[PDB]
Design a protein around this ligand. Sequence first.
Ligand SMILES: N[C@@H](CCC(=O)N[C@@H](CS)C(=O)NCC(=O)O)C(=O)O
Ligand SMILES: N[C@@H](CCC(=O)N[C@@H](CS)C(=O)NCC(=O)O)C(=O)O
Ligand SMILES: O=C(c1ccccc1)c1ccc(O)cc1O
Ligand SMILES: O=C(c1ccccc1)c1ccc(O)cc1O
Ligand SMILES: [Ca+2]
Lengths: 241, 241
Amino acid sequence: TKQITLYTATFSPYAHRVRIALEEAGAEYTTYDVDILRNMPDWFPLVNPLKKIPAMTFGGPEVPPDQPSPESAKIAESLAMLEFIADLFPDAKLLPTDPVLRARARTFMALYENYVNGQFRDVWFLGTPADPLLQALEMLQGALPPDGGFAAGEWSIADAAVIPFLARMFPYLEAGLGLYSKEDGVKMRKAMASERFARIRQYVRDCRARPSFANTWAGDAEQVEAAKTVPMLRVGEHHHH
Amino acid sequence: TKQITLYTATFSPYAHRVRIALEEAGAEYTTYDVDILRNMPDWFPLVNPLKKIPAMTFGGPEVPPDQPSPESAKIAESLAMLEFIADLFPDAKLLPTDPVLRARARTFMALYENYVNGQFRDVWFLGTPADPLLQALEMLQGALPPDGGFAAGEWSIADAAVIPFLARMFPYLEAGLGLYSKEDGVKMRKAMASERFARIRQYVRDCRARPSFANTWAGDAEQVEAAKTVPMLRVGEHHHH
Ligand SMILES: N[C@@H](CCC(=O)N[C@@H](CS)C(=O)NCC(=O)O)C(=O)O
Ligand SMILES: N[C@@H](CCC(=O)N[C@@H](CS)C(=O)NCC(=O)O)C(=O)O
Ligand SMILES: O=C(c1ccccc1)c1ccc(O)cc1O
Ligand SMILES: O=C(c1ccccc1)c1ccc(O)cc1O
Ligand SMILES: [Ca+2]
């Protein structure tokens, strides 16, 4: 009965995680875009004092999203939201029931957050060399079951956590968006098309094929256009050596 | 019934997290120290291919820790281990049952990992400025229940995740450990003794008072001596800004 409102933005992979999870849960919920990076509403710190997207409200009285109520629970951090949605919709099996397989899902999420996401940040926002990122992606790929399936076998929130980032990489590369040089851009594209990364391409296809992805993705070209609005992606700018 | 082996190191706050959780669970477990920073055993990548402490094996046949079995599950990443221990020992109530309180624990852990941990690492091991660490710590304090109590009210794995780092900060500061400037040392010592930080000092006292901390801590002086073995804590080097 308790309402869910997700404050969102199309460019944001962190918001995308939570939308995918709500889709897989079969939840009833509201999304409300926020221009967090250019024109933050002055009421936004009431739903998240960290001034980051996503933000979530839960319960309280039904109110327009730009008039959040003090009675709703204010939930921050995308992975905490993923675990919360799993807790709220236990019959949707957003996590395995078996402890070791659940652990595989939590490990995959931590591998992405601890070793991969910062390399994406380095390469795309600072234009540092791509090799440490390719190395971290090979490590992540290796945590996948090699003969197919999702991170923990069956689909789980761990795949919600990771696919927003991997799904952005390919079209952003094809647009040359990000502070890396053309040389590293070509090197990444060749690498991500090579047999070294066949397994992660299968993984990206399997995740994108689910309705939770189709329903929360603007389309490749539209997502590239939203990403061009991100100040830190510095459209037209590239660093060399 | 299945055996648990935790591969540990006294200096490591990551390994400390998992010991605390295993104490709180009432688990039967083995610990095995690994000189991971100065002399890794050749067999250790068998228990963690990432070559990081902690490492955990679960189930398989009962074997000496330095002869790990192929048959045991290999669980990496300390936060995944905390969730696993909660999953294995539900009667221990290592997380709340209420979904919103569970989200408070997950949020606290993410706030610590995403905004505070890296500041500890960078201030202590790189000597970066202390002000952003103090800001991150004031943010994390603000997430605590104001009147007293642990991150989600009752004790949970969120407190296992955070106390290893907060509890090291104070004796590290007093012993003068880390690559930050004299001026930033004085600054952090005055800050952490000031009224601004009274709530986090009570949190630290409350976590430390539990047997789970007492039985997993070597003592302040002993922990300071272990930290001194860390190569990156190069004695006599300081950075200035
Ligand atoms: N750890 C946070 C990260 C969220 C995040 O960094 N969001 C970006 C958009 S992709 C943002 O809102 N930045 C605004 C700011 O840094 O204050 C989460 O997982 O939800
Ligand atoms: N994110 C990991 C971090 C573990 C980690 O960085 N451990 C340090 C010791 S405190 C380590 O083992 N370093 C050896 C290495 O990085 O290869 C976890 O939470 O378990
Ligand atoms: O948008 C991206 C992005 C996604 C995929 C590849 C490169 C960048 C992104 C990546 C990290 C991050 O911390 C914040 C972000 O918005
Ligand atoms: O030991 C510490 C540490 C603990 C308290 C204050 C400063 C540092 C530690 C902190 C981050 C990290 O990534 C690895 C580490 O060993
Ligand atoms: Ca508060």
